[PDB]
Structure formats: structure tokens, C-alpha cells
Amino acid sequence: MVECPVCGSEIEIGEVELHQIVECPVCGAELEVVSLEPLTLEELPEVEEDWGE
Amino acid sequence: VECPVCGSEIEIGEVELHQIVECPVCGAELEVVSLEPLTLEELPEVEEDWGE
Amino acid sequence: MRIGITYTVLRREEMAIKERAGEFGEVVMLHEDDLLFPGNYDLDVVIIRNVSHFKALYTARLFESEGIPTVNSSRLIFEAGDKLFATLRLAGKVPVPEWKAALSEGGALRVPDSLGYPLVSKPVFGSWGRLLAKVNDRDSLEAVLEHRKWMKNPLYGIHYFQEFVEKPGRDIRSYVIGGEFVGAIYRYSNHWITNTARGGKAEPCSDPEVEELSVKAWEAFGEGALAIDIFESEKGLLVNEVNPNMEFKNAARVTGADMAGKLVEYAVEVAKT
Amino acid sequence: MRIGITYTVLRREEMAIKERAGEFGEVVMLHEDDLLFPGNYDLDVVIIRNVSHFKALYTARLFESEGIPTVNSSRLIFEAGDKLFATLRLAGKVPVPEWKAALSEGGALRVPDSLGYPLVSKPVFGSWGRLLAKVNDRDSLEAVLEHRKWMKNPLYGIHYFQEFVEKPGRDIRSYVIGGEFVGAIYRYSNHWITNTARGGKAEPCSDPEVEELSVKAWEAFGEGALAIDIFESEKGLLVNEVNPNMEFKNAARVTGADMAGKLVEYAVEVAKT
Amino acid sequence: MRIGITYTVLRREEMAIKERAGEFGEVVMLHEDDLLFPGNYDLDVVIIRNVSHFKALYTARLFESEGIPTVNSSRLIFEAGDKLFATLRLAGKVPVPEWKAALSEGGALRVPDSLGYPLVSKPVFGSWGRLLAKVNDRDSLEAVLEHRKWMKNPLYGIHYFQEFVEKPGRDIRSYVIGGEFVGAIYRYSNHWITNTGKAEPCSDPEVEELSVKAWEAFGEGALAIDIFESEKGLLVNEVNPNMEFKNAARVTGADMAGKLVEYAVEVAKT
Amino acid sequence: MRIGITYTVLRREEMAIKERAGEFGEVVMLHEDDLLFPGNYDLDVVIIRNVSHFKALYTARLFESEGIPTVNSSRLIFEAGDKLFATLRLAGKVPVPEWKAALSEGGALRVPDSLGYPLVSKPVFGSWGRLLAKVNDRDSLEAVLEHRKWMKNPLYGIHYFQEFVEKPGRDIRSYVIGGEFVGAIYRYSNHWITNTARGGKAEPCSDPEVEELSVKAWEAFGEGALAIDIFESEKGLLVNEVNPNMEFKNAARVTGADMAGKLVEYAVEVAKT
Ligand SMILES: Nc1ncnc2c1ncn2[C@@H]1O[C@H](COP(=O)(O)OP(=O)(O)O)[C@@H](O)[C@H]1O
Ligand SMILES: Nc1ncnc2c1ncn2[C@@H]1O[C@H](COP(=O)(O)OP(=O)(O)O)[C@@H](O)[C@H]1O
Ligand SMILES: Nc1ncnc2c1ncn2[C@@H]1O[C@H](COP(=O)(O)OP(=O)(O)O)[C@@H](O)[C@H]1O
Ligand SMILES: Nc1ncnc2c1ncn2[C@@H]1O[C@H](COP(=O)(O)OP(=O)(O)O)[C@@H](O)[C@H]1O
Ligand SMILES: [Mg+2]
Ligand SMILES: [Mg+2]
Ligand SMILES: [Mg+2]
Ligand SMILES: [Mg+2]
Ligand SMILES: [Zn+2]
Ligand SMILES: [Zn+2]
Predict the structure, then answer these.
(1) Measured over all CA atoms, what is the biggest interatomic distance in chain D, rounded to whole angstroms?
(2) F1-96: which CATH topology?
(3) E68 phi and psi, to 5 degrees?
């Protein structure tokens, strides 16, 4: 398990990879796995003017 | 026309729209912004992709 | 087979592509921090998934310079990802909305004379519906041009406009990979800007005409994996835009089509080329 | 013969180009306000002289879309005008300073691993010595990358670096038009950045070695009119950069070379096709 | 008496100010390159003429920190120079256009419910006026907000709006220095943005009265005041504490430079 | 009692403040969408928690204009939130690092004659350790200045510098609310920038020297709830900066102090007068 930085809840996200995008099951926060060795979630950086498809 | 930098009335003669000129007295670089009538302005600001 | 995947973050898309790639050979996950050139890479193909369009473009070119083929290519990322270059390529081959391009505020002021109001203003390099403006009159045109002028990016000084198309509460998003249509959706919204990024709702689209037109639109480029944007109008279907770093998680869910697998299959085809 | 000249302001270079063009045919002066596409133009060639690099690129592409050839072409303006795309085409063909490219701040931190210190940071699309930085240590690298990070233009997220070359108080600027070496100057400065735009002082350069290297650098591209930047170093001459919208008023004044005339003669050759 | 003048470029206004100041004592011309703090400056007053409003503000504060009074003061430069702070100060005292302020784009979207269309969007810090927008409908509102959002300058997070005032093809710029009315001009144009050879003197006694009342809302300094005529009478749009006057001086014949310097020497004497 | 809380995003601290208030009266949560002026608000005091310093400033000023007091006040947010205005207020009263301010690039180039190398360049309005530079030589000073110039936010035209202070692997963040010391922490890092936003780690600080110095710093302003940044140096404690939008979640966690509760108490105190 790990703490959501928006909500504060402890959640299970499963077998994640580094820089992977996850949705918090409680608050619906979109988050980035910024570390695995110490499992750390983080809110995404700001959208740049050339981000997308 | 008056130079917008030094205030002097100056002689330019045959010139084109958006031509860069030089003031005879104060030597400021100026842009011909209009010919309706002949109107001088200082150079616009440099943008991040300006040059060669 | 060593298949590189180049990424900023791992969205559903990238997770699914990674899965599919693993069935064909060894996958090398390449975060942007890992990208250093000239470098010593041992790769048969790279699938380019960077969230930044310009980072995608430059990393594709760099891998090409190491002799490593790229999906999509740097040439396609640039042409398809620029609205104006793409419209130029599309204009021969498929119906597109009426458009104009101007190189100064002064020239942009004449655009209504050709297109009429309302018109749409948009930056040449954006995505996700960013900086799209519906301009109903001269006062709005001036405001839009004044703001674009003040913005730092010199690209915002390339003034691209289209006639405003009256859509029926939705537009169409289709996918063509290596010349094969893989699926399409409608994107519904109460607002005229329909991207799922803000956030249009996806429904499957089985329209055979969008399939035929999407393949034609792809053929104007003749390569790669493209997400195509199509509008319905009183004059019929119009091709608006093509996107060289496709998102598809909703499109996949709603159509049941395997966009990710098709992209990877195409990548293994170019790896053997 | 109708020869177009596209321009932002008419510098000395543009007035000279205009005069020479008038010896070969009718000259159509096209300020940016006069550029609106699609449009009806009756022109055999356009000489692209917009001060903005990006406006030059897009106006070339638009004239090409109208079947009007352009000097320089959109392809050359894009490739030559980008530090990274240009060194990629120069690499293996002529000697260049040691270089490194990264795609993120975290990747850029590793650039000194290859290049050592001091190194040179520069933006991929710049000119006139703009935003050039000499970085002597880690703290300086961090400062530069911190600032690039917060700048709006996504292009500042492409991190391009060279080894700092110890030049003898000057560098070299040469000109090659259609394969013909037309002349060269030294640009002297007591600052390591020697551009004449920043106070650099022009002096004629007659080294036969720079002529041959200049032609070879041009042949890496294979078309157009290029101002080439060369460095003298303890390991001989290195090609640094090429420039597709050449300034030359100081170079022509100092060498007697008629860069304007040669540029127009090349334009007239491309008009014939 | 030692009078400093801070400047970005030496132009007509600065040379005029220097000349009048020369009558009262020693003049010290301070280019921005000469401004370094903390430092030792031997000055009784500083006349602030930096072209940037932000540089003006900081240089005034910095001189104040060395015990040197400044015309205009750092307090007036901020209060009067910011559109929002300024209208809050004017609102109790003189008529102003109806206005609205929001702190997010969602709030800004409700502004037309108060102000109606057309409305005017402008930045709080602006002076050049390139970012002024006449917003006629919701699509234009959204376009303006979307562009401001992507400028990522946090000062565009203050969304300030006014009703669009139907002016009679001109507006008014008056000058009040130390409480004294020194002159006013009409600025004519066929565009709704009249901002400045289409100027002439304004001798409407009513703008003189209103102009002094506007200045009295701040109670100090040298201000240019922008006034609109409308169906419901004169309205004070904004005040400007950096005061360009070269045009208004020529058009009206008022010695604007001299009045500014005179005020500065009275300030120098505490 | 009716206590307004103004916020950008609901998180731990805002939620902690919400519950401590409410013990005193009715709490009204005001999202930035709810802020429209002139407006009819029925509040005895507003606790200003907007993430943007600028939005906080204007929000405070706007509530004051409706006769509603604010914690912190617009005046304090202005003076304390701007680093240069703040150090000017501190200069007489408490030791600060040596500093210098210039109004142009040319003046800024003279700064190291006063401060020596290395020195620290930072924006007057910044937080979270963003755009900080440690400048070891002239080349770096030039680089930082070049980049500031091309950002074209007029605020970066104010060039604020400090001597580089050699801290012992950490710095100190103390909290003073209405003149009462409520707690302090150490922030540890092996980078010279020790922000917890930057990956710094917080521990309790019990040093009575910093408690004394914290209250003295607060007193230089004479109002509000402030977070106070202190450095330990070879020449004793120094007050680097003050912050009128105190983040405290780590400080409260690690100290056991009720920052939320103290803040609310002060606000009800402010509501009285
Ligand atoms: N000319 C137009 N007429 C009507 N709607 C448009 C027009 N241009 C764009 N849109 C709407 O805005 C959306 C985004 O525009 P698009 O051109 O695809 O840019 P992006 O690359 O940001 O998706 C489209 O999907 C469509 O819903
Ligand atoms: N790696 C380097 N070593 C030494 N000097 C350099 C280096 N790169 C650039 N310079 C100096 O800075 C000038 C401008 O750099 P350049 O790469 O030509 O960019 P621009 O397109 O801005 O001219 C060069 O003419 C040269 O004097
Ligand atoms: N609310 C408005 N209604 C009508 N015209 C306006 C309004 N606001 C500004 N203008 C016009 O635009 C000009 C510049 O506006 P202003 O508010 O002074 O911005 P700036 O501070 O850039 O001068 C004014 O002199 C006036 O002519
Ligand atoms: N002059 C300096 N010397 C040494 N370290 C500094 C200096 N200025 C800032 N720092 C370090 O950087 C951190 C952030 O700087 P600060 O001035 O607080 O800016 P911010 O408001 O962005 O936090 C400080 O907590 C300190 O650790
Ligand atoms: Mg798109
Ligand atoms: Mg689209
Ligand atoms: Mg160049
Ligand atoms: Mg060069
Ligand atoms: Zn959560
Ligand atoms: Zn002159």
C-alpha cells in the first residue's frame, strides 16, 4: 500500500512501474508513481503547450 | 518627419515601407512604419527566433 | 527483436503497448532521462510515445541518426503534428474545412473576407483542444491576435484559421495504422470543442464512409500510425487534423479494437524493413 | 521573370537583394501583411528574407504549396536553422565540435560525463548569439537547466550542448551559394561570443582551408545559400553551425563580395527549375 | 538641493525634467545601470521616470529605504498603477465604470451576468494596452480567458473587467500634480481604444473638478487621469502614476515638466 | 461567528483549518470560483489559503474592500511575500544574509564586487525553491542574466542577490502566529536548496535561539501568521526570508504543534476588532 498525496488515504495500486499513471480509488486523483524503492505517488507536473497526441 | 528618438525634423527621401533607416542627426535606427504619411518608429523588440 | 519504447509517463496506452511489444521480443523502456545522444543503443525499432510533441519529434530524429527506425518517423511527427503542414498535405487528397494562413496580424485581419464569421483560430502545434478560439466578429479577432502577438512562442505568430463547422454535437476520431483502419469513435460534447481531454464522451463509430475517408487521409502521408479527426458538415465529411502520438484508451474500451497491438505489429514490420 | 522578396523589415541586405533582383526581372516586394494563403501569386521564385526564422520557414512552405520555388527551401530552412538537425547532417561529413543532446533536465545533468567542463549550452532555434551560455561547473549547469525548464517555449526542453572550444579571439563566417564559395570573414571579439549582432568586428578571411571546408559543409545539405560558422581550435577547423537566412552587410563591406547578387543569381537559376 | 532623476532612455521628457530641476540645484541623472542597493546616494529627492512600472516601483521603494523621498512614492506607484487597487480606491470617491473582478476562469464566466455584453477585459498591470479586449459574447470571453491562462504569468490570474462604455469617439486624459489641475486633452480615434496627432486641449470645467477629486482619492503625487464621457456622465477609468506628458504638454502648452519638478522640490523639503 | 476559508485545492491543511474553525462558528469554504467582486459576503473574517501568492494578495484586498478582515492582510501578503520588500523590512531588526539589488543587467554585473563569489540569484516573488541559482563565476552570472532577460516577465527585471551562505546541510523553518512562537523544524538535504517541496526532510527544532530570533523577525512586521526561514552560519543565525502563506503540514506532523488551530484562533482574534 501507499499514501495518496491529495486525499491522505492508504491505497493498493498493485504492481506499478516508475512514472506510471494511477487513479486513486477513493478520491479519483490522477497521480504519477515518482519512486518505487520508496513507493511514492505525486500529482502530475503542469501541462506544457505542446503536450498531447 | 520628426525622428521619434531625438525630436529633430529630418530628411529621408526615397524610402520603402518597413525599411530600416538611420537618423541624420542622432544616428538612431528607425523603421518606416507608414507612408500614409511617412511615419518613423523605433525598432520593434527582438523575438526569440529573430536572426539568420 | 529489441523494441524500445520512449515515454514521459506510462499512461494506459503505454502500459498496453509495453505488454504487446513483450510478446514479440525484448522491450527496452526508455524514459526521457535515459535519452542521451550520440549514444550506444542496440535497438531494432523505437516506438515514440513522449507526451511532448517536440520531444517526440527530436527523439525520433536522434534515433534515426543512430540508424534505428522509429514509429512514428520524425518526418511524420513534424508534418502530421503541424496543423498547417498537415492541411497542406491533406488538401490535394481529401475534403478539408476551408482554411487560411497569414504571417502577420495585419494579414490575419483580412481572413474574414475569405472565410466569413464565425471562424476558428488555433495554434499550429497544439493538441487536446488547447488555444482553440471561436471568433464571431472583428472585436474577438483583434483580441485573439493581440494575445497571440504578446505570447512568447514565435510559433503563435503563424496564424492558422478555419471556417467554423457546425457539427452535430460531436466529431469523429478514427485510427489508421500502416494503411489499415483499426477503428473509430464519436466524441460527444455539449461544447463545440469535443476532445476527450476536456472531456468529450466516446461512442463507437461503424460508419463505413469514415473508414474509407480515414484510409485516404492516411494515404496523403503514406506511413505510420495516425489518429485522424473528422467533422460532419452539411457538405459532408471533412478531414480536420491528424495526430502522430495517438491516445486511444477510451477509443479502445468503447470499440473493443486493439489499437495498442496494431501499433506494435506495425512497429515489428518496420523493424524488419 | 517575377522575383518575390518576403520580408519583415528592409535591412541593408534586403535593399541590396532588391536592386540585384531588378537587373534580372520584375521585383515584387512582399511584406508579411501581403502574405495570405491559399492565394493567387504570379511569381517565378521567392527570396525568403523574413527576420523571424519560423515565419521564414512557414512562408517558404506556403509558396511551395502554390508551386512557387523558394530560396531557401522550407526543408533547408528547417534543417539548417536547427542546431541539432544541422549537426546531424554535418556529422561524419565535416569535423564539428564535440556535442551532446538530452531530452530532459535529468538527462542534461549527464552531459558533462561525456563533454567535461566547461561546456556550451545553446537553444536549438536561436541566432545572433542569443541565450548562449558558458557552463564551467555543476552549479552553472543546474542554473541554466532551471531557467530553461520554466521558459514557455517547449523547444527550450531540447537540450543541446558542445564542448567549449578555445578559439583565438575570433571565429570564421563563410558563405556558400549553390555550391560556390563566395567569401569569408573573421569575426573578432574580446568576448567568447563573436556575433556581429553582439559587437563582433568583421575582417576578410583568405585561408584556402576554410574555402574547402565551407564547400563540404554546404554539400552536407546539397542546396541553397548558407552562411557557415567555423571555429579554429588546437585540433584544426570545426564547423559549428549553418544559417539559412544569411546576414552579410558587414561581410560584403569587408570582402567586396556581392552576396546579394550571388543570392539573386541562384534564385534566378531555381526559377528556371 | 540635489535632485536625482531615474530613467531608462534619455528622451524629451527626461531632458525637460533635467532642465527645470537644474534651476533648483544639482541634477543627478541615474540610468538604471547606476541603481545598486544598498548604496550611498547623496540626494534630497528622486523623480522616478523608469519606463517599466515594475522597475519604477522597486526603485522608488529602494530609494525610500535609503531615506530619500521619491516622486512618485512606491505606495502611489503600486496603488494607482494597479487597475484593481486603483478602482477600489476610486470607487468610494468618484464615478467609475461598472466593474467586476474574479480570481478564476470559472468565476470570470459569471461576470457577464453582472456586467452584460459588451464588456472589456484588461490586465491589472497593463499600460501599453495591447491586451485590452472588447468581448461581445461568451465565445470571445472564453477565447480571452484561454489565452490569458496560457501566458502563465500569475498576474493574469486576476480577471478584471469593466462594462463597455459607449464614448463619443474620444476620451479624456487630465493631469493633476500635488492637488493642482495642470491641463487635460481629448484623444480622438475611430477605434474604441483611443490611447495615444488626434489630440486637442480639453477645457471642460467638469473634468477639472472630477480630476482633482480623483487625485484626492490617493491624496499625493503626480497623476495622469483617464476619464470617459458617457450617457450617464463622466467616469474615471484609471489613474497613472508614471505619467507620460510630452504630447499633452505640446497640445495644451502646459509646463508639465516644470510642475513635476516644483512638486519634487516641495517634497524634497519634506 | 462565520469564518471564510479561501482555497485553490482542498488538501490536509485546508481540511485541518476547516475543522478547527467550526468549533468557533459556521465555516464557509470559498473555492476560487466562488470569488466575485463587488459581492455580498457575510463573513466575520477570511483565512486566505490560495496557493498563488498573487491570487492570495488580491483576494485579501478584495475582502478588505467589502469590510471583511483577512488573515493574512493584503499589506502583509504584499510586504512579506516579496523578498526584496521583506528584507528591507527586516534589515534594521534582525541579521540577514548580505544582499544586493540592481535594476538592470549592467548593474547586476557589478553585484559580485560587493557580494563576492559564490552568490545566490533568486526571483523576488518565488517559492518552493524555484529559479534559485548558485552563481560561482562571471560566466554563470551572464548565463542567469541572459535567461532572465528572455523570460520577459517584468518581475525578473528586479535582480535580487544574496551571498551564498554555507549552511550545515540544513536550514530552519519556524512559525509565528500573532507574535506567539508555535514551532520550528529543520529541513535536511545534501543539496544546498533544502525545500521539502524539493525533497527536503523535516525534523523538530527546539533551539531557543531560533525561537527568540523568529519572534523578532515577526515583530519587524507586527502582524499575521508567518513562516520564517532561518540559516545557521559561520557568523550565527540569519533570517533569509519570511512567508505569509505558511505551509505547515510537515511542520505540524513532526513537531506535534497545532498550527491549524493556532491559525484559526488568530483569525477569530482578528475578527473581533
Ligand atoms: N473549424 C472548426 N469547426 C468546428 N469545430 C472545430 C473546428 N476546429 C476544431 N474544432 C473542435 O475543436 C476540437 C479540437 O480541435 P483540433 O483542430 O482537433 O485541435 P487539437 O489538436 O487541439 O485536437 C475538434 O475536435 C473539434 O471538436
Ligand atoms: N562551443 C563553442 N565554443 C566556443 N565558442 C562558441 C561555441 N559555440 C558558440 N560559440 C560562440 O558564440 C557564437 C554564436 O554561437 P552559434 O553556435 O553560432 O549560435 P548563433 O546561431 O546564436 O550564432 C559563435 O560565433 C562563437 O563565437
Ligand atoms: N471600459 C471601457 N469602455 C470603453 N473604452 C475603454 C474601456 N476601457 C478602456 N477603454 C479605451 O481603451 C483605452 C486604454 O484603456 P486603459 O484602461 O487606460 O488601459 P491602459 O492602462 O493600457 O491605458 C482608454 O483610453 C479607452 O479609450
Ligand atoms: N543565500 C543563500 N545561501 C544559501 N542557501 C540559500 C540561500 N538562499 C536560499 N538558499 C536555500 O534555498 C532554499 C530556498 O530559498 P528561499 O530564499 O527560501 O526561496 P523560496 O522562497 O523559493 O523558498 C532555502 O531554504 C535555502 O536552503
Ligand atoms: Mg490534435
Ligand atoms: Mg483534434
Ligand atoms: Mg546562427
Ligand atoms: Mg552563429
Ligand atoms: Zn486519493
Ligand atoms: Zn534622431
Answers:
(1) 58
(2) Rossmann fold (3.40.50)
(3) -110, 120
